[PDB]
Amino acid sequence: SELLVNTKSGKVMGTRVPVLSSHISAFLGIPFAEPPVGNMRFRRPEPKKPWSGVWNASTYPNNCQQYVDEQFPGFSGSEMWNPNREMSEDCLYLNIWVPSPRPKSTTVMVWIYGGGFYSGSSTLDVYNGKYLAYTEEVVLVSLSYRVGAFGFLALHGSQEAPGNVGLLDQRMALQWVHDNIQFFGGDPKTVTIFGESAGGASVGMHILSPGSRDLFRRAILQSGSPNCPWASVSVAEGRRRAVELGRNLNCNLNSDEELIHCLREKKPQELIDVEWNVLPFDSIFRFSFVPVIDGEFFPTSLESMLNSGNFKKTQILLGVNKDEGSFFLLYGAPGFSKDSESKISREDFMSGVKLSVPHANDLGLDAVTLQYTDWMDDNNGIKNRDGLDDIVGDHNVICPLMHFVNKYTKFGNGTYLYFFNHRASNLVWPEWMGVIHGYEIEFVFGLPLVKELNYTAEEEALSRRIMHYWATFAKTGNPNEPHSQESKWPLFTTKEQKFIDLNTEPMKVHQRLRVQMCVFWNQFLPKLLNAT
Amino acid sequence: SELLVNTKSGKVMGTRVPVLSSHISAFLGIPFAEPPVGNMRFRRPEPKKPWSGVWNASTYPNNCQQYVDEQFPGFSGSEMWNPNREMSEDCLYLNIWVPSPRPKSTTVMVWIYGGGFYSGSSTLDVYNGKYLAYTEEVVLVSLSYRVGAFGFLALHGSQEAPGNVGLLDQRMALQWVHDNIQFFGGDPKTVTIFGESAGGASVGMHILSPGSRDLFRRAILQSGSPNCPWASVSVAEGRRRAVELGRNLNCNLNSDEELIHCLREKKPQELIDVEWNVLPFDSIFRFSFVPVIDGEFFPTSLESMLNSGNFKKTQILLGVNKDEGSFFLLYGAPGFSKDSESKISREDFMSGVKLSVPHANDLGLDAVTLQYTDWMDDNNGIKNRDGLDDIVGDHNVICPLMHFVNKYTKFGNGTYLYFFNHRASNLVWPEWMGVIHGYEIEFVFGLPLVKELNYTAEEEALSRRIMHYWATFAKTGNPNEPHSQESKWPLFTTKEQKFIDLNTEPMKVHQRLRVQMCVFWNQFLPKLLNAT
């Protein structure tokens, strides 16, 4: 039977699903690790033990235990990201969407969801691989990993919570796709991993980590790179927050074993209730428990790895959204409202720069302010709003990704850079937010193709171009069709530094994506804070 | 006789001179101090002793002993600034241009030439007061003062070379205009002093110094303000250069008396031959001997005086040229040539920033470079050239004057700001130099009116507007005609910060002259260098 697959871990029974008035197979909820519960909390994942009989994989698995956003009850705009299933510490499962009829050896794409390393589910609607699998004819896999303290608590030196166990979860899932995707029609020697936000940073992290390099062929990173100021911490800081977390739940702090044990005896929702209290600064776009530069998953520091060429040389396609910042100013910067034009005054502007560059002395806050203020119109509320929006995005997503792409391109075998600047017509968020963080995902998964979701004709077109770019790249390492007649997506080179915009308009090539600011955030400011 | 005047110092015989096919009286070379020769070198000026008989004032006096530019032998472009008379330590004289018939009590204007405090003459052609006196009907006085070491050597504590004796010379000249201009038809209670470059800085210095405040009514400052980075030094630095000068001429350095005596025995051209060797840095737009914040001529520091409102509150009219920098890059920055487009490479650009901000650490040089580089076109030779041109001007003339005008306007009784951005059609300098430093002077003195000099019809028009602005302001404290129908030169206010362009085009008002950069040069950079 087409829905029955015999893997190396046991037999799996999938289900047939409808898509764009046709059908494909779907194996949902396949396990790849032993339930990380009980004494296994904070501990590295262990391979799932084989099973006899057939595993029922026709319904989604549970969602990792996480923090849930309640800032806008009812609002689809924010709930479409919250977990849509029972949360449980027993979260390690993966989903496979296979074409019909089953391929013999087709291209594979593994999706790693984002969420700030503190949230995320594979089961969300926007992450439905059926549209993409069906339309591009690829085996779509979407894994899951532990988030928040559960997947990133770090007491370096102790094997009870080494840290980065969340990245290992992903590696585990990848190991399985490598040892078994062939029984699903997929070709293991041609797997592309791609992510967004924390997922884009995770991809970049597997490219750097020696232990993962051999498990994939190409990579796609969206609005996220490993060297982002929020994507990682030092063992010292990881240790500091591990303890402080323990201090909020009144735990014995005489030793690591002492602390870890107290934490393992707490209910999941108790570590989550106090999670946000460990941050070192009043900040925006920063998360408590995130990957830590331990010395194992990451040999040395990220910066020296990038400068030494110590990383998987392959092809990569990456890009960013026009307005990455807005989403975080709405939730944390004073002056922004989901229901107003949110024009910002001088006072709130400066309160914004303090919140955005939390690790900056008073001289740095001045540098940032000077670099982002039009003194000929200093009290223009729309300019202070759009300036704040820029600071948050440039510092957190764009200038960090441009530093990665430039360092990478020097030893890689192909780079393709994009700039998504199209605001979907059916967005429920205010206009001042613009091309919001993460909203390029719907086009990647092809949601515009389903009529009932209400996208325009040109939007559905954009979605097909993009699915064909991602899918073509995943297969060949080049987003462009061999002898096509369409516009070519030029290659990014240390010299030209070309890139393209991705919107419903005639492709346009450009150069040096936001260099003026990228130089301020990568060269000048870093140096300034060092000298002062 | 109209050409005979009986002053409080003695009788003076002037001469009748032709101007625009008419005539006016001219008393040239009137003495106002005792010859500062011999043991009087570096010493404060003493009032000229009265004389019997009639003093012959029909020919120009001698020029102060100074450094002469020989960078372009023959070139009118540079020689029109060199001394046109025998140089002599016996330089303290003044020139008066009086209308015909002699007025009873007309407005007076006293001109103080510029020259970096190291050069300058009242006798230069461009400084001929006859055109202005005649055309506007004012008594035009042009004084002279000692420059270079001769007028600015400073060994604080010693009465043999207190320093600022060059500013005192000017004060002396002003004291005379105050005690005698009435016998020339001038009204002493309505005298306007105006200057350019070092002269503009001298004016501003009399506005600050208690000892001069009572000797004039209004002030006009052109391309120069007292708080310019080149206009003054500390007693410590003045002392350092006084000694080093002594070290170049092999002088005994055991004591001030020891040093001063050796210097007083040297021929004038010997102190000049080594003058430029005392500068502390490899620099551009910096001069050896300049005014020093002693504690007498200047009560406290200039910055605290400006913040405390400690200065003559009156009306002032001031402005700058579009391209103040160019002239100094030509002479000292590598890459610039009087005969080429002088496109600058990255290497020379950066060699330029080092030369322009001599007192800046490696972090500051980076700030300046980042603030003045278009990274989307970083290797555009015309952009690096125009950027360098801007740095030099903003840091040395514009951003410093805007800081003065803003501090002043807070306690003054009227401010009028202009921006001269018209390149004369007959200029002999290359185009890349633009609206060159000091070339607005010809319009102030009305040279365009004389046909044979070859100016265009619209240029002569511009010259008359300007002479009427300066002359009207000198008389009333407002550049505009009471009930005129012409365009009004708006007043500059802390709030609006309005100003006008001064060119052959329909007057246009604007706001915040170069604020983006002025904030970088007045607030950020200063602070940066302090913290680092």
Curated annotation (Swiss-Prot), chains A, B:
Query: Mind telling me which InterPro entries this protein's record contains?
Result: AB_hydrolase_fold, AChE-related_enzymes, Acylcholinesterase_fish/snake, CarbesteraseB, Carboxylesterase_B_AS, Carboxylesterase_B_CS, Cholinesterase
Report the outcome of S197V.
Loss of activity
Q: How is its activity regulated?
A: Inhibited by substrate concentrations above 0.5 mM.
- Summarize the impact of E196 to Q/D: Decrease in activity
Top-level taxon in the UniProt lineage: Eukaryota
As for family, the record states: Belongs to the type-B carboxylesterase/lipase family.
Q: Report the gene name.
A: ache
For this protein, the record's PROSITE patterns field holds: CARBOXYLESTERASE_B_1, CARBOXYLESTERASE_B_2
The UniProt keyword set, sorted, is: Cell membrane, Disulfide bond, Glycoprotein, GPI-anchor, Hydrolase, Lipoprotein, Membrane, Neurotransmitter degradation, Serine esterase, Signal, Synapse
Glycosylated sites: N56, N413, N454, N530
> What EC number is given for this enzyme?
3.1.1.7
The name of this protein is Acetylcholinesterase
The entry's function note states: Terminates signal transduction at the neuromuscular junction by rapid hydrolysis of the acetylcholine released into the synaptic cleft. May be involved in cell-cell interactions.
> Catalytic site residues?
S197 (acyl-ester intermediate), E324 (charge relay system), H437 (charge relay system)
Instruction: Look up keyword RNA-binding and say if it applies.
Output: no
Q: How is it modified after translation?
A: An interchain disulfide bond is present in what becomes position 593 of the T isoform.
Q: What is the effect of changing E196H?
A: Loss of activity
How does this polypeptide assemble, per the annotation?
Isoform H form is a homodimer; the asymmetric form is a disulfide-bonded oligomer composed of a collagenic subunit (Q) and a variable number of T catalytic subunits.
Per its record, the protein catalyses: acetylcholine + H2O = choline + acetate + H(+)
The GO biological-process annotations, alphabetized, read as: acetylcholine catabolic process in synaptic cleft; choline metabolic process
The disulfide bonds in this chain are C64-C91, C251-C262, C399-C518
Q: Give the molecular function GO annotations.
A: acetylcholinesterase activity
Q: In which tissues is this gene expressed?
A: Found in the synapses and to a lower extent in extrajunctional areas of muscle and nerve, and on erythrocyte membranes.
One CC-aspect GO term? side of membrane
